[PDB]
Design a protein around this ligand. Structure first.
Ligand SMILES: NC(=O)C1=CN([C@@H]2O[C@H](COP(=O)(O)OP(=O)(O)OC[C@H]3O[C@@H](n4cnc5c(N)ncnc54)[C@H](OP(=O)(O)O)[C@@H]3O)[C@@H](O)[C@H]2O)C=CC1
Ligand SMILES: NC(=O)C1=CN([C@@H]2O[C@H](COP(=O)(O)OP(=O)(O)OC[C@H]3O[C@@H](n4cnc5c(N)ncnc54)[C@H](OP(=O)(O)O)[C@@H]3O)[C@@H](O)[C@H]2O)C=CC1
Ligand SMILES: C#CCN(Cc1ccc2[nH]c(N)nc(=O)c2c1)c1ccc(C(=O)N[C@@H](CCC(=O)O)C(=O)O)cc1
Ligand SMILES: C#CCN(Cc1ccc2[nH]c(N)nc(=O)c2c1)c1ccc(C(=O)N[C@@H](CCC(=O)O)C(=O)O)cc1
Ligand SMILES: Nc1nc(=O)c2nc(CNc3ccc(C(=O)N[C@@H](CCC(=O)O)C(=O)O)cc3)cnc2[nH]1
Ligand SMILES: Nc1nc(=O)c2nc(CNc3ccc(C(=O)N[C@@H](CCC(=O)O)C(=O)O)cc3)cnc2[nH]1
Ligand SMILES: O=c1ccn([C@H]2C[C@H](O)[C@@H](COP(=O)(O)O)O2)c(=O)[nH]1
Ligand SMILES: O=c1ccn([C@H]2C[C@H](O)[C@@H](COP(=O)(O)O)O2)c(=O)[nH]1
Lengths: 510, 491
């Protein structure tokens, strides 16, 4: 009964020119070593590999230490390998077999009592045979999120949708996202399916008491499970309420998520997020811009329905031109408290530039505890097309020059807005880290009224049947040119290794 | 042979009076009692205790009963009743429970009880029968084998009586996954933990105790404005239920008078700290001395003037500040009034927030506000919840005070809106322990929490609007904390 261990691009690519397609992934090698070596004593595990895989390995590491090595080949002989390098004392002699079935026979015949687990370690010849024989119980797959030139591929398999969009192999384990050398990746395991404190439990018994994301996944390390579980939690436990929009709501109050920013970027994968939209909106905020036509004109229409003639009038703002969000978000960030006129006015130097203050405090006194920016100005709310939802953020620097950010959001459309908000403030954290010579560490999301609209519930349930993919990496390009927060442009960003499931249509509650 | 005692007692160990119970009917305690005693089982009770039971329940059903009188229609002693359980009933008897005094004290002297199931009634009541003193006693009030708590429930209440439940003891797919979890856990000296002997930690105060432990264990050592130094973390969260009891911390006495007076002071939009100090509430004095104000570049401020902070922003957001003797009536935005009006007319609105954070006015304040935003929420059962966001949290000194403060605001706002208080949710930014508090906090972490008290609003009929509350309209009922712990304020 065998296990497969592999690293794989989303297109199932595993090799090129008898080498690996990506730069060195040190955590993946640790993992490989740890999975293939470990045992309870008497025994060792075996690794079975094809001839070219054996040849692809550097001499100094071959044979793989403390594991019985078997090579499947018809041309290489056991004495070829013995001649390559002296067998070290205590290690096993390297065996050669003509086929995978022969390797498994040999294991039974001559190494019962001696080997514990059997691992098939590549290449495509062996992976294919192992799947054909149906002898693989588990797949240890390292999912590399970037595509690389490959000439060798892991075979198609039922359940290969954990890699990319199109007996079965279902994931029972999904880790958080790692990275090395600009490459994001994660680890999954698939499974072939087809009176101490005794007497305390009756008090527990009487004090004690449906929708769930991909419930077969038992180890839920991927940080996107916070979002997926929050959807389920609201649907299971939330309360059905009315709402400003007339569309129903199911709501909860006081919710929390947090996303690491040191290895990869929390752009959700369980549906495609509108990244051009987040980037363009954030730059617009940073400008202090209140003209949503500037967004609309670039193909970002997110503010259009709340800046129509009709919606502005429902807000008693007949004097606003279409597109004018009033003194909201970016205006309050860059010009807190300034007297608003319209979206065409120059406000340079009016009011408080909170963003500048935060940055200057980060650069000069990062232990200060007042590094906040707010968009909630009670005096100006009635002049806004919409009172801000994400209304405050706070920054923090630790010991090691690592920057974390908290954002408070009064109102959270879990279906439509939340993924977008996660990406937006995570990006702001990247931008601020760079300009302050800091390392981005963490985004922390504090949520007030956290809701899913009734007309989203069905689509959200489909979303919960999808397992997450490894997070992408976002790189800031042209770092040397970029010295201040206003220097960033729409071209200074690269999203690397993003492989989300398909878009899900969800109407905005207007 | 294993024996357990089931009891409910006041902090002074009171269990009865005039052959009855001291307190009004405790519904949940009775459930608890029912369950615990059956899973047949034997309950064993003294003569008088049998009488006290109403006849409709007198045979305690689904359990063997034993009365230990020497005068009735049934053993003559407690040793006797234990013999009668080995000899006969040896089979089909699981555990045995003793359920009066005399019986309790017999069971303790003979040393046969291995566990104590105690319902701690938080209030005192007249009693003439008391549970025996016993080592482990401090679990009730502040007054060799010993009894150690192993379980401490959340706080309940019925008929205006707060109470707790504690238990004391006499003293392939997982295989596939394993190697992967193991390496992920590897990286990565002696952790502290609040009362590690308590396994089942239902008491909501454990959030605060665990928070202290987590900061000291996993926080990073940093500098800070005051010069004292802290250990800090960022982004922490607690929540306290308000429907049964009130989260006034019990592992050290919280300064309740101070909480109440500061809050009423906020609500009036008062910015003169001498009004607090003149009432014996000196919490703001060191941040409004001549010296501190000058350090803030405020030489023109009069001693005691906090500037346009907290309450001023609540009641007059954005108004132009003069001094603390000015009348600001009608000026600025009355956020508190707006919040209340929205709660009363359209409680599904998602903009029910109040902020103290006004960037245009920060430099004019003695201290930028720590608790700077709160948001309210109503469900479909008319239950009110409140979230407060705090940018900077002095865990040892400030946090217990802040918890009580906003929980109290929640009770007040619920009342004038004809809602019921449900939950206070505490969101924390820079969450820190000052270096000179660490030792004191380590003492505190050795204390088992007591049941939370309940706070009642008095004269409810007179109180219609948030401004109507006075310092005399509240009663804290059943508060039984451990002693105060001195913690010096970093200025
Ligand atoms: N990303 C990853 O996880 C991994 C990537 N790689 C790499 O993948 C590509 C190399 O693998 P691949 O090209 O498939 O090389 P293989 O390791 O499969 O070696 C190829 C050959 O191995 C022996 N052979 C294999 N299958 C059979 C069979 N089914 N029956 C009989 N003999 C068999 C044969 O050698 P003979 O001709 O002597 O008979 C066949 O020619 C490389 O890039 C290697 O580095 C490898 C392992 C893992
Ligand atoms: N808070 C709680 O959890 C509980 C409180 N209570 C309160 O109990 C009061 C009664 O307790 P208490 O007055 O101590 O009543 P008991 O139930 O202990 O009855 C007293 C007597 O019981 C039999 N007895 C007890 N001890 C001995 C002994 N050591 N040797 C021989 N016989 C013994 C005797 O009756 P005889 O004279 O016939 O020999 C002794 O006089 C009430 O207020 C009752 O409600 C009771 C249960 C629980
Ligand atoms: C949060 C936030 C910012 N916002 C601003 C914004 C404004 C009003 C709102 N109103 C409501 N009820 N919910 C929102 O989330 C919301 C968000 C967004 C608005 C729309 C989309 C959106 O429609 N996303 C879709 C469809 C459009 C597209 O892709 O072009 C998507 O699936 O990407 C995203 C973000
Ligand atoms: C929260 C809040 C409101 N506040 C306001 C307030 C002002 C400045 C602060 N400064 C610091 N560093 N931490 C605080 O918690 C703090 C709190 C409080 C202030 C003091 C006490 C208090 O109990 N002080 C102690 C110790 C005085 C001393 O000797 O230093 C006392 O003796 O009671 C409580 C609440
Ligand atoms: N997930 C996965 N990642 C891989 O890199 C991988 N590689 C191969 C084949 N190629 C190689 C090449 C070198 C070493 C190697 O030197 N291994 C050392 C790593 C030691 C360590 O980091 O502790 C070993 O002793 O395992 C292993 C396999 C087969 N399955 C894989 N599977
Ligand atoms: N913790 C504790 N609380 C008590 O009230 C208590 N009471 C007694 C003695 N008095 C009483 C009185 C009535 C019932 C009683 O009627 N018990 C029923 C019903 C419980 C219910 O009404 O839900 C039972 O079988 O549990 C039990 C004990 C002994 N130990 C106690 N221990
Ligand atoms: O950044 C944003 C902006 C808006 N929304 C959705 C929040 C709500 O479901 C609706 C906003 O309307 P009110 O909360 O103002 O009713 O905003 C978000 O989730 N994120
Ligand atoms: O309600 C309050 C007021 C103050 N503090 C303590 C917060 C800090 O440790 C110190 C305030 O100083 P700065 O955060 O402003 O530096 O305030 C609180 O914990 N709660």
């Amino acid at each position: 009964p065998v296990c497969l261990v592999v690293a794989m691009t989303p297109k199932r690519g595993i090799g090129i020119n008898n080498g690996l397609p990506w730069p060195h992934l040190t955590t993946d090698f640790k993992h490989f070593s740890r999975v293939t070596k470990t045992t309870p004593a008497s025994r060792f595990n075996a690794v079975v590999m094809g001839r070219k895989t054996w040849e692809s390995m550097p001499r100094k590491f071959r044979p793989l230490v403390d594991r019985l090595n078997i090579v499947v080949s018809s041309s290489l002989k056991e004495e070829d390998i013995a001649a390559e390098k002296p067998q070290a004392e205590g290690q096993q002699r390297v065996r050669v077999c003509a086929s995978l079935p022969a390797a498994l026979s040999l294991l039974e015949e001559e190494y019962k009592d001696s080997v514990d687990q059997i691992f098939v370690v590549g290449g495509a010849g062996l992976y294919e045979a192992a799947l054909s024989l149906g002898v693989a119980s588990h797949l240890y797959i390292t999912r590399v999120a970037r595509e690389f030139p490959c000439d060798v591929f892991f075979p198609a398999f039922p359940g290969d949708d954990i890699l990319s969009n199109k007996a079965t192999y279902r994931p029972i384990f999904i880790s958080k996202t790692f990275s090395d050398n600009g490459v994001p990746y994660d680890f999954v395991v698939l499974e072939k399916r087809r009176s101490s404190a005794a007497a305390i439990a009756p008090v527990l018994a009487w004090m004690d008491e449906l929708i769930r994301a991909v419930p077969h996944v038992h180890f839920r390390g991927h940080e996107e499970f916070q979002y997926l579980d929050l959807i389920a939690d609201i649907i299971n436990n939330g309360r059905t309420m009315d709402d400003r929009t007339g569309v129903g709501v199911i709501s909860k109050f006081g919710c929390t998520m947090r996303y690491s920013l040191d290895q990869a970027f929390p752009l959700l994968t369980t549906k495609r997020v509108f990244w051009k939209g987040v980037l363009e909106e954030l730059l617009w905020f940073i400008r202090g811009d209140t003209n949503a036509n500037h967004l609309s004109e670039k193909g970002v229409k997110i503010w259009d329905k709340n800046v129509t003639r009709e919606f502005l009038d429902s807000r008693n703002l007949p004097h606003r031109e279409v597109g004018d969000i009033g003194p909201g978000y970016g205006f309050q960030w860059r010009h807190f408290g300034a007297a608003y006129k319209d979206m065409h006015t120059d406000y340079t130097g009016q009011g408080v530039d909170q963003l500048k203050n935060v940055i200057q405090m980060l650069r000069t006194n990062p232990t200060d505890r007042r590094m906040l920016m707010t968009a909630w100005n009670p005096a100006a709310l009635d002049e806004m097309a919409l009172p801000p939802c994400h209304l405050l953020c706070q920054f923090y620097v630790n010991d090691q020059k690592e920057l974390s950010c908290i954002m408070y959001q009064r109102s959270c459309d879990v279906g439509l807005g939340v993924p977008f908000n996660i990406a937006s403030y995570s990006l702001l954290t990247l931008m601020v880290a760079h300009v302050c010579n800091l390392k981005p560490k963490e985004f922390i999301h504090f949520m007030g009224n956290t809701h899913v609209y009734t007309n989203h519930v069905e689509a959200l349930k489909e979303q919960l049947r999808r397992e997450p993919r490894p997070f992408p990496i976002v790189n800031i390009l042209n770092k040397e040119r970029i010295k201040e927060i206003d220097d960033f442009t729409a071209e200074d960003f690269e999203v690397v290794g993003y492989v989300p499931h398909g878009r899900i249509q969800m109407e905005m509650a207007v």
